[PDB]
Amino acid sequence: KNVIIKWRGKPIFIRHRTSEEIEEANEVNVATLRDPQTDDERVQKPEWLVMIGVCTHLGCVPIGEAGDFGGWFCPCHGSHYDISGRIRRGPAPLNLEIPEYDFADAETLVI
Amino acid sequence: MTAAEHGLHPAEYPWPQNGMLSTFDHASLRRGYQVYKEVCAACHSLDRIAWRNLVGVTHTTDEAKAFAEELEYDDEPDDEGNPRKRPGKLADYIPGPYPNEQAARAANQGALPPDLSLIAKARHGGADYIFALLTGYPDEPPAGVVLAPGMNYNPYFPGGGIGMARTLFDGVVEYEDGTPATTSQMAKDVAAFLTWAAEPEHDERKKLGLKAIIVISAMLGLSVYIKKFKWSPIKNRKFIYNPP
Amino acid sequence: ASLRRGYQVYKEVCAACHSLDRIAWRNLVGVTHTTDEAKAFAEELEYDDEPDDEG
Amino acid sequence: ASITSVVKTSELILKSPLLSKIVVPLAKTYVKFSGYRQLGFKMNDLIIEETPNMQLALRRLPPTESYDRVYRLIRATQFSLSHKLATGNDITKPEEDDHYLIPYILDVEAEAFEKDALDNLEVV
Amino acid sequence: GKSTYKIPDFTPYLKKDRNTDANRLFSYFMIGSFGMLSAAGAKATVQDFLSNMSASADVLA
Amino acid sequence: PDPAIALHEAAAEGPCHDFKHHFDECVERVTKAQEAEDYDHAEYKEDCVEEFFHLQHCINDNTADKLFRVL
Amino acid sequence: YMGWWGHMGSPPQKGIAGYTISPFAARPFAGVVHAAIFNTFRRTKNQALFVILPVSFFYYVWTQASEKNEWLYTKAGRHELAKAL
Amino acid sequence: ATTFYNVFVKRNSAFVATILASAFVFDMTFETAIDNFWDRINAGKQWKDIRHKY
Amino acid sequence: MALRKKNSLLNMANSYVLDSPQPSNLNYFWNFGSLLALCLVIQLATGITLAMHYTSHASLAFDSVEHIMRDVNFGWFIRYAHANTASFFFICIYAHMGRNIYYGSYKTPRVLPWSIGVIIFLLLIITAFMGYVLVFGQMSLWGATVICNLVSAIPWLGEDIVHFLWGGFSVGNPTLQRFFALHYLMPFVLAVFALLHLIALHTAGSSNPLGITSNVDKLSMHPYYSFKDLITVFAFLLMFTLFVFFSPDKLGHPDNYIPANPMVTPASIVPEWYLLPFYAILRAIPDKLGGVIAMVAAILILLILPIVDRSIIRGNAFKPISKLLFGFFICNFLLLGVLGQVHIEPPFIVLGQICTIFYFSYFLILLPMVSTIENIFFYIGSL
Amino acid sequence: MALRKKNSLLNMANSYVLDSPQPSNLNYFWNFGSLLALCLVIQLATGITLAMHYT
Numbered sequence A: 001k002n003v004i005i006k007w008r009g010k011p012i013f014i015r016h017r018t019s020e021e022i023e024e025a026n027e028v029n030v031a032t033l034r035d036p037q038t039d040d041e042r043v044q045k046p047e048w049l050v051m052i053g054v055c056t057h058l059g060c061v062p063i064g065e066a067g068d069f070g071g072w073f074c075p076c077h078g079s080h081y082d083i084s085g086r087i088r089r090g091p092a093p094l095n096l097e098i099p100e101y102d103f104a105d106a107e108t109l110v111i
Numbered sequence B: 001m002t003a004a005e006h007g008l009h010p011a012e013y014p015w016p017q018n019g020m021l022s023t024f025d026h027a028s029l030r031r032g033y034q035v036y037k038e039v040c041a042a043c044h045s046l047d048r049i050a051w052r053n054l055v056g057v058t059h060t061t062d063e064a065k066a067f068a069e070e071l072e073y074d075d076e077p078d079d080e081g082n083p084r085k086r087p088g089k090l091a092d093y094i095p096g097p098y099p100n101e102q103a104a105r106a107a108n109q110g111a112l113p114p115d116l117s118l119i120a121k122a123r124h125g126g127a128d129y130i131f132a133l134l135t136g137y138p139d140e141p142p143a144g145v146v147l148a149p150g151m152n153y154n155p156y157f158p159g160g161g162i163g164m165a166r167t168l169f170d171g172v173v174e175y176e177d178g179t180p181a182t183t184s185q186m187a188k189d190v191a192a193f194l195t196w197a198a199e200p201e202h203d204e205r206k207k208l209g210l211k212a213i214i215v216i217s218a219m220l221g222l223s224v225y226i227k228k229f230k231w232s233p234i235k236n237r238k239f240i241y242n243p244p
Numbered sequence C: 001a002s003l004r005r006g007y008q009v010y011k012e013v014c015a016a017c018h019s020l021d022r023i024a025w026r027n028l029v030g031v032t033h034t035t036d037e038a039k040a041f042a043e044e045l046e047y048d049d050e051p052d053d054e055g
Numbered sequence D: 001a002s003i004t005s006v007v008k009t010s011e012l013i014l015k016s017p018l019l020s021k022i023v024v025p026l027a028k029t030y031v032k033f034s035g036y037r038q039l040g041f042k043m044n045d046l047i048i049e050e051t052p053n054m055q056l057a058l059r060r061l062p063p064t065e066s067y068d069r070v071y072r073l074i075r076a077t078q079f080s081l082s083h084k085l086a087t088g089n090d091i092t093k094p095e096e097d098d099h100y101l102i103p104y105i106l107d108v109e110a111e112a113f114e115k116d117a118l119d120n121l122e123v124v
Numbered sequence E: 001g002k003s004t005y006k007i008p009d010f011t012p013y014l015k016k017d018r019n020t021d022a023n024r025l026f027s028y029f030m031i032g033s034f035g036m037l038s039a040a041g042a043k044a045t046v047q048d049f050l051s052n053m054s055a056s057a058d059v060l061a
Numbered sequence F: 001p002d003p004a005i006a007l008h009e010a011a012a013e014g015p016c017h018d019f020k021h022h023f024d025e026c027v028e029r030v031t032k033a034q035e036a037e038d039y040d041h042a043e044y045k046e047d048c049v050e051e052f053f054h055l056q057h058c059i060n061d062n063t064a065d066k067l068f069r070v071l
Numbered sequence G: 001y002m003g004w005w006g007h008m009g010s011p012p013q014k015g016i017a018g019y020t021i022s023p024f025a026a027r028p029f030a031g032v033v034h035a036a037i038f039n040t041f042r043r044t045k046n047q048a049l050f051v052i053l054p055v056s057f058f059y060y061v062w063t064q065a066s067e068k069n070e071w072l073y074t075k076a077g078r079h080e081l082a083k084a085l
Numbered sequence H: 001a002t003t004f005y006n007v008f009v010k011r012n013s014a015f016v017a018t019i020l021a022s023a024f025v026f027d028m029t030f031e032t033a034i035d036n037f038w039d040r041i042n043a044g045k046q047w048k049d050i051r052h053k054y
Numbered sequence I: 001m002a003l004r005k006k007n008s009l010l011n012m013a014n015s016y017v018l019d020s021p022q023p024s025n026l027n028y029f030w031n032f033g034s035l036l037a038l039c040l041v042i043q044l045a046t047g048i049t050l051a052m053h054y055t056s057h058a059s060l061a062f063d064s065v066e067h068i069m070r071d072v073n074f075g076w077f078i079r080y081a082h083a084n085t086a087s088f089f090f091i092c093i094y095a096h097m098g099r100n101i102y103y104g105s106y107k108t109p110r111v112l113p114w115s116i117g118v119i120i121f122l123l124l125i126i127t128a129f130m131g132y133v134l135v136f137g138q139m140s141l142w143g144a145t146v147i148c149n150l151v152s153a154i155p156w157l158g159e160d161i162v163h164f165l166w167g168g169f170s171v172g173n174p175t176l177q178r179f180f181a182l183h184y185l186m187p188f189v190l191a192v193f194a195l196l197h198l199i200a201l202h203t204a205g206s207s208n209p210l211g212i213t214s215n216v217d218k219l220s221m222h223p224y225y226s227f228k229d230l231i232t233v234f235a236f237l238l239m240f241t242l243f244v245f246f247s248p249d250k251l252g253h254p255d256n257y258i259p260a261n262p263m264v265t266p267a268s269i270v271p272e273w274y275l276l277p278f279y280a281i282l283r284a285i286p287d288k289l290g291g292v293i294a295m296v297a298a299i300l301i302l303l304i305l306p307i308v309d310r311s312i313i314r315g316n317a318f319k320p321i322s323k324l325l326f327g328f329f330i331c332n333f334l335l336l337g338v339l340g341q342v343h344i345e346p347p348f349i350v351l352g353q354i355c356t357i358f359y360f361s362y363f364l365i366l367l368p369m370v371s372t373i374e375n376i377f378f379y380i381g382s383l
Numbered sequence J: 001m002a003l004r005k006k007n008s009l010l011n012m013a014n015s016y017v018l019d020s021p022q023p024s025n026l027n028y029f030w031n032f033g034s035l036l037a038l039c040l041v042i043q044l045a046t047g048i049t050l051a052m053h054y055t
């Protein structure tokens, strides 16, 4: 599941990623990525994808679960984000920003 | 984009109010309010309309006060500062079915029924879109469409899957004026009603525009006469040149 | 130091009847109280949250 | 641009037999389509005059030529505002489209460009 | 083409009854109609437009 | 009973017969394709939305005025 | 570069006589029918190409582009769309 | 006709007074005329036409 | 001496609106100036009126606009007049700029009025953009989001600048309040620059459609141009009436009647029609920073027309090749407009790039080439 | 001729704030004019700023 938390008026996508989702994200060779990053750089905890859910193209919000890399699909110009929230296809230049977030408890994070 | 992703564009129906000189059919507006009250108001709010707005459009002052007085609204606190309710007055707004968005979504399998006060201006198509949407649920979704859970297929809605089920069926409303309440009749009435809700000045606006068109046309004609009159010395000027 | 003492008088005497509506807990921080003390004061109270998922 | 530039470039074209063979017929059609003759203008009447150089060249016109120019501009302005064209004797015939001003502006500019050159001279 | 006392041909445009009161009156009827509609239009414009400043319907309730 | 039902049926059999037949043939193909096994593990799953839109768009063009005339 | 009445900055004028008649002595709409028909036809014919050429070209461009775009997002155009992306 | 000119047009004070009085009359009558016309072309549609049922 | 000339204050009015000497042959395209003055007055009158009813707080802005539509007497009219006249202001401003380009109004001695004009055009864009945000509907918000995130492309400081303009980390209440204050102010600045470009023009006087001097044959601004200006005022008000009273939402986008929701993104974010050409130019460049520079350059490049037009003749009345080139330029500017509202899909991506190259190449290549060649053709062709 | 006198726009500034011929003996009470100009500028700057925060 992916939650949407408003944080500074921007939406925050929080996905509780499954084991196989993590695996899917850890596949793509870093080399072939507009914005080259691995999931370990993105998340500080593999079960908590926390991203700022604004598309890096113009600044629409991607609809999650949709896409072609089954992560997030920006409907505005058709840019596809990953399960890491990395850009794969479409106009968007960068991967979906990661806020500065810390796990205060194991059950609560501050953003 | 795929046509699916856009939605089918609604037909252009000949609404009574289409036409530079045409008002709404107020009998239709009244019938449409009854459809809103008995069908849509279960899920959709009409937050921008006050009871006073129906007066002299669809209802007499007495009928509208009766509608308001059936409801309870939040009063100012009593003398011990405890909260109180009062009966509604004409200045009150028509109250919504849900206290907040979260309650609304919980009742509608996640989907949030929008407020209908502006929906006729807030969608490409206007009345035609509302009419097309309410009447456009096929018995069976086109073969090969995979609907998301809690979605219903409707081609006019962009993407095809709408969280609102078909709601108008023959005889869900019993009109007080003896008009046969067919699906299409109820959709026509409610779509007229919602169009009025979105633009309640529509009748007055088009009458003043008729006056404006006439006066401004006359002033345009006269301004051309006056311009030609004042300019005729310059247009009619002739020269004789004798090189010195 | 007087401001801090004065807050304690407000809290124990005046606040029974008088509000201080324009002051946020953050305003005390670095004036009368450390961030920790002020968060402790705020966390003792209950405020209206956004509705739950059933609204 | 400077009239000097226009004149020099045109002379390069008229010299080359090849170039003139292809350009002179084009330029004749261009001027027919341009249609300034239908308002009774000579080509030179159209040159931009709100420049110090051109103001000086106009002051150097012989009085007769100057009076005639004023009449052509006033006549054309009247046809313009009436949305009429010249008819009969008012239409500029190709033989009457003489470069009355080009000599004067070429002299004004010659001096102005010499002045610029000489302002940049270096004693060797 | 040479004599300046030979006034150019204006017969296409000259009104025969040009110095009659009838003639002037007509043109002032056009100007006055235009002034009348402008006055009526300005009154309508001002009255309608400034009425925005009168109590709105929510206030009147 | 609902005037639209009759008008839509009449317009499908009449002026929009070519589109009716297109949609029908499409549905036949897709149902048959879904019937076959290893359909769930196919790359491209064909729909009939396009044909449906062509039909509906046609029906609406031939019906809109007639329908509002009987309300 | 422009003066004012009395010293407008015209080269000296001489030899032009200008004549006109009063607006009250003129028919303001004299020969308006002839002008509305024959004069407008003349003036429009003379300028027609300068409007028709660019408009017809850009309309053709748009028509081709909008029709291709429409076709690419059909079922038939699936493959050509896949290549174009 | 000279009489008409002399009375209503010759003095601008009179002409402006005539224009404003005409504007007043036009404004009032045009209002009434449009009202009636609008009611005829939108007959049985407006609230005034259905109000009698209530 | 007459009072209108004697008295210093009256004399300034006199010099601009009454005795001002004008060419006697200005055609109807010289009337857009006064229509833009009328638009600016209608926008001030309706704008100040809406400000008396509008609330700039984000919790109440959209509701205040509904209050204007529904409760304020004639509020519907004042709102639609203000919204539609913003469209007509841009029709008139593009017409007025088109007139100026076709008739070479940008040439000496009128480079200064032209250059101030280009700034007026930028202020109008900013003014209209901020006004659009004030409704705080979905297009308002998503417009402000997109446009102010372009500033993020300014290197090093871009992010910081955006947050400073928003007054926050997103478009929200602080942004709305500050846009209200600025949108109120900017039209007054725009009026002052409009007045400066006229004062600048007063030195040379108006150009005319023949591109020759008019010093030979002048007409007082009143009554001749006064009465000519009334014809287009009434023509304008007829068009205004058709939109405002009969089709008030034809020029707009329904998405702005949905209240702003930072979560839900609307179907398609396209700007108001009059911004669409610049938006297409921006989309043409793939780089974010490149796109922004190109978009600004598409306006500022107008400032170089005085240099790149090499003609010895002012304006296009007599230049058949220049007229054809100008026709292509204008139609391309409209095609750019259309491409601003299509989806970023084939084949419009490549087409948008070609139209953008054509737009710039007019100023940089074609106009300098064509104007040089026509100089030579006039001279050889009249020998 | 100097640019400040030649150029129409500059000339207007010049005529008011630079070459404007003044009496040589104005005393300090002639300075309130410019203070009122300063007040008017401060009020516009602060006023427009408050308008960005005021509801």
Ligand code: HEC
Pocket: B035, B036, B039, B040, B042, B043, B044, B108, B111, B112, B113, B114, B116, B119, B123, B130, B133, B134, B157, B161, B162, B163, B164, B165, B167, B190
């Ligand atoms: C019991 C539920 C329910 C009833 C009854 C209902 N609606 Fe809805 N309606 C919804 C929900 C939920 C949505 C949101 C659908 C979505 O966004 O997927 C919706 C959406 C709409 C929309 C907007 C679709 C869009 O474009 O966003 C309109 C218009 C509409 N309803 C009108 C009506 C009218 C008119 C009636 C009855 C006369 C009606 N509804 C009855 C639940 C209902």
Ligand code: HEM
Pocket: I029, I030, I031, I032, I033, I034, I036, I037, I040, I093, I096, I097, I100, I105, I106, I110, I113, I114, I116, I117, I118, I119, I120, I121, I190, I194, I197, I198, I201, I205, I206, I207, I208
């Ligand atoms: C509020 C916006 C504007 C207003 C009210 C305005 C008004 C006017 C007026 C009244 C004139 C003289 C009459 C005329 O030629 O139409 C004029 C001339 C001119 N304007 Fe504008 N203008 C505006 C914007 C612009 C813009 C954006 C430009 C240029 C980009 C511009 C450039 C010019 C030029 C060059 C002239 C001189 C043209 C000539 O007469 O040959 N103006 N303007």
Ligand code: HEM
Pocket: I040, I043, I044, I046, I047, I048, I049, I050, I051, I054, I065, I079, I082, I083, I086, I089, I124, I127, I128, I129, I131, I132, I133, I134, I135, I183, I184, I187, I188, I190
């Ligand atoms: C050049 C002048 C102006 C232009 C081009 C302009 C443009 C706009 C536009 C485009 C909108 C969006 C309209 C909508 O869709 O509802 C708007 C809204 C607004 N404008 Fe202006 N405006 C101008 C001047 C003014 C002025 C002087 C004020 C004075 C305060 C003002 C006050 C408003 C207000 C309050 C709104 C929001 C209410 C609304 O949306 O209708 N405007 N403006």
Ligand code: HEM
Pocket: J040, J043, J044, J046, J047, J048, J050, J051, J054
């Ligand atoms: C001559 C210029 C001005 C004068 C004399 C003036 C005067 C005042 C005064 C006396 C107040 C009451 C102050 C208070 O006790 O808080 C005030 C408030 C205000 N003024 Fe102005 N003002 C001026 C210009 C402006 C301008 C141009 C704006 C632009 C919007 C503006 C915006 C405000 C606002 C928003 C307030 C209310 C906030 C507040 O009270 O501080 N003012 N003004």
Ligand SMILES: CCCCCCCCCCCCO[C@@H]1O[C@H](CO)[C@@H](O[C@H]2O[C@H](CO)[C@@H](O)[C@H](O)[C@H]2O)[C@H](O)[C@H]1O
Pocket: B204, B208, E046, E047, E048, E049, E050, E051, E054
């Ligand atoms: C210096 C100028 C003098 C002061 C200006 C006066 C300002 C406002 C005065 C009148 C405003 C309210 O006055 C009122 O106007 C409105 C419309 O404008 C009229 O209202 C009438 O027409 C409107 C539409 O035109 C309808 O919506 C309304 O049902 C009808 O009664 C009222 O009949 C009149 O009583």
Ligand code: FES
Pocket: A055, A056, A057, A058, A059, A060, A074, A075, A076, A077, A078, A079, A090, A091, A092
């Ligand atoms: S805005 Fe996200 S795809 Fe363009």
